[PDB]
RNA sequence: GGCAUUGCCGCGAAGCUACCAUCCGCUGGAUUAUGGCUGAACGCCUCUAAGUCAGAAUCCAUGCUAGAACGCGGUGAUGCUCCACACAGAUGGAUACGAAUAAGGCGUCCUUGUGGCGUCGCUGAACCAUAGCAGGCUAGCAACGGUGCACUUGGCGGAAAGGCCUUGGGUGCUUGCUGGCGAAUUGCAAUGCGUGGGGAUAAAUCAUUUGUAUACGACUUAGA
RNA sequence: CGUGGAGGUCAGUGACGAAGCCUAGACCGUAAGGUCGGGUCGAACGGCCUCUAGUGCAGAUCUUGGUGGUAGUAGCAAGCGAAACCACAGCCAAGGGAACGGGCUUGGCAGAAUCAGCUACUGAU
RNA sequence: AGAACUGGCGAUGCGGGAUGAACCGAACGUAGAGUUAAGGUGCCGGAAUACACGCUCAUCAGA
RNA sequence: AUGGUGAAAACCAUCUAGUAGCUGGUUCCUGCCGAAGUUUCCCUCAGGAUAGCAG
């Protein structure tokens, strides 16, 4: 139903998203999560900041350099939340994760290509109105990730370059809507409508 | 000892690289951020100290300083660096077409056998009204937040027989990136002076690789806050002459420095002691910020410069002082 | 001075090397404890529930050290030629606004607005493509469009641009409409770009030399 | 079901290759094992009805013989050259009731190969 | 702590309880098909990101 | 213990395969049946004398 299924984190929930992205892999379904940074969790911020640092104090004894490597970059922050549900050892896994690609923001060559959303993992469709809820972004920032800015800016730029596009397009489909609107009514038409079209 | 300087291991090169650079002031026009030279000797300075509220206010103070030999450094290229989620990234470097024999020598480990085919087809790529060169300059003119300049040492002017030009990178803190690349456009192949980066009475910082002994030594160290006392000029005679002393002499001691020759070019006289030893390359940066204390405020009045023979001992300054005291000898007449 | 398990003594550069000496040893956010501001719950009050201001040698960056030996980029240098051989899951289409969700699209009027009027959502169950030997060979009509392909004009894309648009001309196709032929026997299912040597020219290593480096390597050098 | 020998029998098989030995070969029997092809071999051997026994092995710090890892190591006061020892391997965290964690469960992770210090660790290719 | 009573393990695999002497289900020839127990159905994990009524914000909730 | 050999307390050869209130090991397949964990005195400690369960 589509070789690749670029998703857009923007307004999702680490866990649910993940999960569903998981299944999709183990069942041969390439994926590519974007805008990672603008992901979402549940519960105040000070929360996720703890339920993490703890994950930070981790580290191995004798050699801290060989223990739980604490990735800051969101993309990763989330990639973990995922590799956590995927045997990520037995070849069946490796085979998966090998089917993923979590980017922070939306770099080419996807920018130019449609995306989607997992309706079963939206802050706005799971979280009871007005209720604390992180935003990875900050969360990452607060714990290392040194780029929230770059993407940020280097983002707005993307939205431009596009927004501009749309216009051209929207301004295009404005014609069609007419072309048919007019070329409508005629005969050949009527008929179709009958059958449904 | 100090846990921070770990791993206490050997540096990658003799020319250490500057990890950071000063921030930015966009309101200013284009200016360089750092400058390179060679450490050469340790001279004695006495001067009246115009430091307010001191135990040594308006009194004469002795202190040992170092003279870094700094030739006029010449640009041979310019680089653009984009801002990424993964840090910085060099998207394009571009070069100055007519490079010296010295920079061409840097690109080979064996210069003697080499057919000297350095920037041949790249110079042939230039050979038109631009088209490819001006395209890559436009590439940096569009993207790339930070713009760095490729420069090298005029080693022939230096009395050292090393004959191999050190390439370094120096960014620009003069805002609007269009002006950065247009400054670099005007300044391809051009020799940049020493006094056109630093002045006297400025706090600076030097980077160097520290005097190896046996593992102990040969690390890259950065010491900060050092006052430039004198920015000298080789073409100007009487560099050792102050406003007070005014005796026509070079800052160079009698028969050159200890393990270093004469100073036939520009120099910087830095307070205290720079890391590394003589014959070593250093790179002087400009403090990263406005370091406003009263240690920075005072404009110094250099009273006298010691130019006695450090090789052994010295009771004289010029060779003129030797025969003035000794009179005349056997081999003379 | 030939010699003295390094003969004694006077002093000494080079080195071994030391609080036994000299120099150097940083600024932005975000907080705790607390002090507040706005202000409910609870027609008063209240630093708090929804917000917000300040603030610990804290925290996290800046700076500093190392650079993933399977992390990455840009740039310089010619790989070229002569013979002999070898050959983790495509199956119509990833079908580009952003933001909000106690709100939003789309269309219209303009009084250019947090403006008015109209209209949509309740799933992509859509949209666009879709007929021909796995897709042929030939005849028109009507359109002046659609579409493929090799070229050309101009423009844009640096985040991983490595692509997307356009102008002109040429050449196919057109199922938009009407035709004219071929399909069997496949027998009632079994999907139907490296080697092994030459030549020519770029470079690296070894050997030599140097020492700022050194357990050995490595590293810095120099030499048509 | 199998082994050594005995009586009987198959006018059994057999230098046109018996017995044995192998074999990424085939068949039969739930199995003990039996049968066959191929290769190697060179002189005896097997089925059937019975008899008889010094009859079937993974162990005994088993006995005898042979051969490894250790190891080109310790060593001899470039060459020569052991032995002790050896079920099997040797990353951490947490749980695994029982002064039992080394194999399991759930996680962190993990690139070939190797030398040197007190298998980690410093460092070096 | 002691006494008596009936089971479980002992001589006993199998499904489940993350993992297990004492829990839960179930006493085993070799298979094919169907239906279940105990336990479960976000994903690792086969199975409803099922339906319906309410409740819960925790500065290391809770299961 | 018997008999012998050596010597500023011994060894050799037989009796002797000595005696064990024990330690370790015990060699093919399949089928079928299948426990006991204990009653009472001999006193028990040791070995049994019996009843119970399986034929």
UniProtKB/Swiss-Prot annotation, chain A:
Pfam families recorded: Ribosomal_L13
Post-translational modifications reported in the UniProt record: N-terminally acetylated by acetyltransferase NatA.
Gene Ontology biological-process annotations: cytoplasmic translation; maturation of LSU-rRNA; negative regulation of translation
Localization per record: Cytoplasm
CDD domains: Ribosomal_L13
InterPro entries on file: Ribosomal_uL13, Ribosomal_uL13_CS, Ribosomal_uL13_euk/arc, Ribosomal_uL13_sf
Cellular component GO terms held in the UniProt record: cytosol; cytosolic large ribosomal subunit; nucleolus; ribosome
Site of covalent link Glycyl lysine isopeptide (Lys-Gly) (interchain with G-Cter in ubiquitin): 175
TM segment ranges: none
Keyword line: Acetylation, Cytoplasm, Isopeptide bond, Ribonucleoprotein, Ribosomal protein, Ubl conjugation
GO molecular function per UniProt: mRNA binding; RNA binding; structural constituent of ribosome
UniProt cross-references to NCBIfam families, sorted A to Z: L13_A_E
Note: Present with 43300 molecules/cell in log phase SD medium. There are 2 genes for uL13 in yeast.
Quaternary state and interactors: Component of the large ribosomal subunit (LSU). Mature yeast ribosomes consist of a small (40S) and a large (60S) subunit. The 40S small subunit contains 1 molecule of ribosomal RNA (18S rRNA) and 33 different proteins (encoded by 57 genes). The large 60S subunit contains 3 rRNA molecules (25S, 5.8S and 5S rRNA) and 46 different proteins (encoded by 81 genes).
Protein family (similarity comment): Belongs to the universal ribosomal protein uL13 family.
Protein task: Component of the ribosome, a large ribonucleoprotein complex responsible for the synthesis of proteins in the cell. The small ribosomal subunit (SSU) binds messenger RNAs (mRNAs) and translates the encoded message by selecting cognate aminoacyl-transfer RNA (tRNA) molecules. The large subunit (LSU) contains the ribosomal catalytic site termed the peptidyl transferase center (PTC), which catalyzes the formation of peptide bonds, thereby polymerizing the amino acids delivered by tRNAs into a polypeptide chain.
The protein's name in its UniProt record: Large ribosomal subunit protein uL13A
UniProtKB/Swiss-Prot annotation, chain B:
Cross-link entry Glycyl lysine isopeptide (Lys-Gly) (interchain with G-Cter in ubiquitin), positions: 28, 125
Keywords from the UniProt entry: Cytoplasm, Isopeptide bond, Methylation, Phosphoprotein, Ribonucleoprotein, Ribosomal protein, Ubl conjugation
Mutant phenotype after disruption: A mutant confers resistance to trichodermin, a trichotecene toxin produced by plant-pathogenic fungi.
GO molecular function, one term: structural constituent of ribosome
Sites of Phosphoserine modification: 13, 145, 243
Modified residues annotated as Phosphothreonine in this record: 92
GO BP terms: cytoplasmic translation; maintenance of translational fidelity; ribosomal large subunit assembly; rRNA processing; translation; translational elongation
Family annotation (PROSITE patterns): RIBOSOMAL_L3 (PS00474)
UniProt xrefs under Gene3D superfamilies: 3.30.1430.10, Ribosomal protein L3, domain 3, Translation factors
One Gene Ontology term, aspect cellular component: cytoplasm
Location within or outside the cell: Cytoplasm
One Pfam family of this chain: Ribosomal_L3
Family: Belongs to the universal ribosomal protein uL3 family.
Quaternary structure (record): Component of the large ribosomal subunit (LSU). Mature yeast ribosomes consist of a small (40S) and a large (60S) subunit. The 40S small subunit contains 1 molecule of ribosomal RNA (18S rRNA) and 33 different proteins (encoded by 57 genes). The large 60S subunit contains 3 rRNA molecules (25S, 5.8S and 5S rRNA) and 46 different proteins (encoded by 81 genes). uL3 forms together with ES39L one of the contact sites for the signal recognition particle that targets ribosomes to the endoplasmic reticulum membrane.
Function: Component of the ribosome, a large ribonucleoprotein complex responsible for the synthesis of proteins in the cell. The small ribosomal subunit (SSU) binds messenger RNAs (mRNAs) and translates the encoded message by selecting cognate aminoacyl-transfer RNA (tRNA) molecules. The large subunit (LSU) contains the ribosomal catalytic site termed the peptidyl transferase center (PTC), which catalyzes the formation of peptide bonds, thereby polymerizing the amino acids delivered by tRNAs into a polypeptide chain.
Other noteworthy facts: Present with 450 molecules/cell in log phase SD medium.
Name the UniProt record assigns to this protein: Large ribosomal subunit protein uL3
Source organism of this protein record: Saccharomyces cerevisiae (strain ATCC 204508 / S288c) (Baker's yeast)
């Amino acid at each position: 139903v589509e070789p690749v299924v670029v998703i857009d984190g923007k307004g999702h929930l680490v866990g649910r998203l993940a999960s569903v992205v998981a299944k999709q892999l183990l069942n041969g379904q390439k994926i590519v999560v974007v805008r990672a940074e603008e992901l979402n969790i549940s519960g105040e911020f000070f929360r996720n900041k703890l339920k993490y640092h703890d994950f930070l104090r981790k580290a191995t004894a004798f050699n801290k350099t060989r223990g739980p490597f604490h990735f800051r970059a969101p993309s990763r922050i989330f990639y973990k939340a995922l590799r956590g549900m995927v045997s990520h050892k037995t070849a069946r896994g490796k085979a998966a994760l090998e089917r993923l690609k979590v980017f922070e923001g939306i770099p080419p060559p996807y920018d130019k290509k449609k995306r989607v959303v997992v309706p079963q993992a939206l802050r706005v469709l799971r979280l009871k109105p007005g209720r604390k809820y992180t935003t990875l972004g900050k969360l990452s920032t607060s714990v290392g990730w040194k780029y929230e800015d770059v993407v940020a800016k280097l983002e707005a730029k993307r939205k431009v370059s596009s927004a501009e596009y749309y216009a051209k397009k929207r301004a295009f489909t404005k014609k069609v809507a007419s072309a048919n609107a007019t070329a409508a009514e005629s005969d050949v038409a009527k008929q179709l409508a009958a059958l449904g079209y | 000892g100090h846990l921070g300087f770990l791993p206490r291991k050997r540096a990658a090169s003799i020319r250490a690289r500057v990890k950071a650079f000063p921030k930015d002031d966009r309101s200013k026009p284009v200016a360089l951020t750092s400058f390179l030279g060679y450490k050469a000797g340790m001279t004695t300075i006495v001067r009246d100290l115009d430091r307010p509220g001191s135990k040594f206010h308006k009194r004469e103070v002795v202190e040992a300083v170092t003279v870094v030999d700094t030739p006029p450094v010449v640009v041979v290229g310019v680089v653009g660096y984009v801002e990424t989620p993964r840090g910085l990234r060099s998207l394009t470097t571009v070069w100055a077409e007519h490079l010296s024999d010295e920079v061409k020598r840097r690109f080979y480990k064996n210069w003697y056998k080499s057919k000297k085919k350095a920037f041949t087809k790249y110079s042939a790529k230039y050979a038109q009204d631009g088209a490819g060169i001006e395209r890559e300059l436009a590439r940096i003119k569009k993207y790339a937040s930070v713009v760095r300049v490729l420069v090298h040492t005029q080693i022939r002017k230096t009395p050292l027989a090393q004959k191999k030009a050190h390439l370094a990178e120096i960014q620009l803190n003069g805002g609007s990136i269009s002006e950065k690349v247009d400054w670099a456009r005007e300044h391809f192949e051009k020799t940049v002076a020493v006094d056109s980066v630093f002045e006297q009475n400025e706090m600076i910082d030097a980077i160097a690789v520290t005097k190896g002994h046996g593992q102990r030594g040969y690390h890259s160290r950065t010491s900060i806050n050092h006052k430039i006392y004198r920015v000298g000029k080789g073409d100007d005679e009487a560099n050792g002459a102050t406003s007070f002393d005014r005796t026509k002499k070079t800052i160079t001691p009698m028969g050159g420095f200890v393990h270093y020759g004469e100073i036939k070019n520009d120099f910087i006289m830095v307070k205290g002691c720079i890391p590394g030893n003589r014959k070593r390359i250093v790179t002087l940066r400009k403090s990263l910020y406005t370091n406003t204390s009263r240690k920075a405020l005072e404009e110094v009045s250099l009273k006298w410069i010691d130019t006695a023979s450090k090789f052994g001992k010295g009771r004289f300054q010029t060779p003129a002082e030797k025969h003035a005291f000794m009179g005349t000898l056997k081999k003379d007449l």
